[PDB]
Design an enzyme around this catalytic site. Sequence first.
Site, mmCIF file in Angstrom:
data_model
loop_
_atom_site.group_PDB
_atom_site.id
_atom_site.type_symbol
_atom_site.label_atom_id
_atom_site.label_comp_id
_atom_site.label_asym_id
_atom_site.label_seq_id
_atom_site.Cartn_x
_atom_site.Cartn_y
_atom_site.Cartn_z
ATOM 1 N N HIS A 61 0.774 -1.154 0.089
ATOM 2 C CA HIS A 61 -0.080 0.027 -0.060
ATOM 3 C C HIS A 61 0.829 1.193 0.038
ATOM 4 O O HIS A 61 2.026 1.263 -0.526
ATOM 5 C CB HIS A 61 -0.859 -0.116 1.316
ATOM 6 C CG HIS A 61 -1.808 -1.179 1.088
ATOM 7 N ND1 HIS A 61 -2.430 -1.696 2.427
ATOM 8 C CD2 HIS A 61 -2.502 -2.066 0.351
ATOM 9 C CE1 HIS A 61 -3.337 -2.748 2.267
ATOM 10 N NE2 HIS A 61 -3.298 -2.848 0.993
ATOM 11 N N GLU A 64 0.528 2.690 4.867
ATOM 12 C CA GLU A 64 1.528 1.871 6.070
ATOM 13 C C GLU A 64 3.018 2.097 5.811
ATOM 14 O O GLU A 64 3.702 1.529 4.653
ATOM 15 C CB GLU A 64 1.276 0.518 5.943
ATOM 16 C CG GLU A 64 -0.418 0.177 5.396
ATOM 17 C CD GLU A 64 -0.872 -1.248 4.611
ATOM 18 O OE1 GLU A 64 -0.141 -1.629 3.735
ATOM 19 O OE2 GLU A 64 -2.060 -1.742 5.003
ATOM 20 N N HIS A 153 2.148 -4.912 6.632
ATOM 21 C CA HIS A 153 1.278 -3.795 6.203
ATOM 22 C C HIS A 153 0.663 -3.082 7.715
ATOM 23 O O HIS A 153 1.228 -3.338 8.807
ATOM 24 C CB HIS A 153 -0.079 -4.392 5.581
ATOM 25 C CG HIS A 153 0.047 -4.843 4.387
ATOM 26 N ND1 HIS A 153 -0.280 -4.415 3.214
ATOM 27 C CD2 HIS A 153 0.475 -6.285 4.125
ATOM 28 C CE1 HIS A 153 0.007 -5.092 2.273
ATOM 29 N NE2 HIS A 153 0.347 -6.217 2.723
ATOM 30 N N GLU A 217 -0.564 -7.090 9.733
ATOM 31 C CA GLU A 217 -1.064 -5.792 9.689
ATOM 32 C C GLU A 217 -0.627 -5.344 11.242
ATOM 33 O O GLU A 217 -1.350 -5.447 12.281
ATOM 34 C CB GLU A 217 -2.572 -5.633 9.612
ATOM 35 C CG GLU A 217 -3.289 -6.216 8.456
ATOM 36 C CD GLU A 217 -3.665 -5.194 7.516
ATOM 37 O OE1 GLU A 217 -4.852 -4.577 7.791
ATOM 38 O OE2 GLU A 217 -3.271 -4.959 6.277
#
Length: 340
Positions: A61, A64, A153, A217
Amino acid sequence: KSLFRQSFLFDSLDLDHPMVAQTVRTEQGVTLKLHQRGVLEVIPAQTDAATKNMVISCGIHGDETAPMELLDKWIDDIVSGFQPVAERCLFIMAHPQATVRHVRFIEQNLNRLFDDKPHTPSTELAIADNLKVLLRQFFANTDEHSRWHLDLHCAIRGSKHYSFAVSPKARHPVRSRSLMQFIEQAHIEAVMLSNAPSSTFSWYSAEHYAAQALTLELGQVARLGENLLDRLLAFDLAMRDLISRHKPEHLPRKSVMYRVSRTIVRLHDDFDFRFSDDVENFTAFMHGEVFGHDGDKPLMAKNEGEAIVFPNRKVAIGQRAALMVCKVNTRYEDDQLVYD
């Protein structure tokens, strides 16, 4: 050394200045074949047999940034020796441009264009295609038993669990005992076992190479810097032990095992939830409450605790809104993870 210029991270975020490839052996024997903008390879000063071929990637992304600084530092210490090596690993920093433009993505969410299904010509799609080569070129003459792929992420919003992993649903056995142990040493608070295929970069690795792949994440999407690496301490140490292949020096901690219950793909236009944005991931619901109707058929917690994840609002009539999850009890069956 003279392989970079300031930092793998910033020498990659520099548009005007193009960093050419350049392979260089380091004092400790670590061979660093730099390939292209945001792509660094590393090989063990011996390259035994039980060595692993890991693909640690960041920046799928743009928002991030926490993983990049940590990845950015690991590199630093591999060249300076501060950090020993022991596993052939490719450090990907795909989609730099977006990280610079400070946005989540240029055209489309890049981490969705990896399936075999065809997509529309998009900036992110160009990169996807590319990455697939990298993987093809990398996993060459290698063996699945030693293939790893960790996509790093950050949370697009709050979450009951600061960081959590997302195991893909592949045709192969991609949830090993060693892959669990890693997550534990990283002190990742939660694990989400995907229930169906996808098109994430992680999924792609497991499905076409049978590699223990994850998408972690870690924390939320703070601005480059803000990211309190302090919290990513266990993770940061864990990775280092992962590439150094040695002494797991700190105490681990079991993670809450979750299971994708079902996807909540939007289909109509009269869509609405029972929350705003203050809705954190893993927000459990009881047998009685509905988190927002759909003009046609409502929406409630099939189970007692069915927690929600990825509460997207930008959801399209085709995309998937959220994700349901149920706390499942696991076990092992010949080094693999299974539930119930």
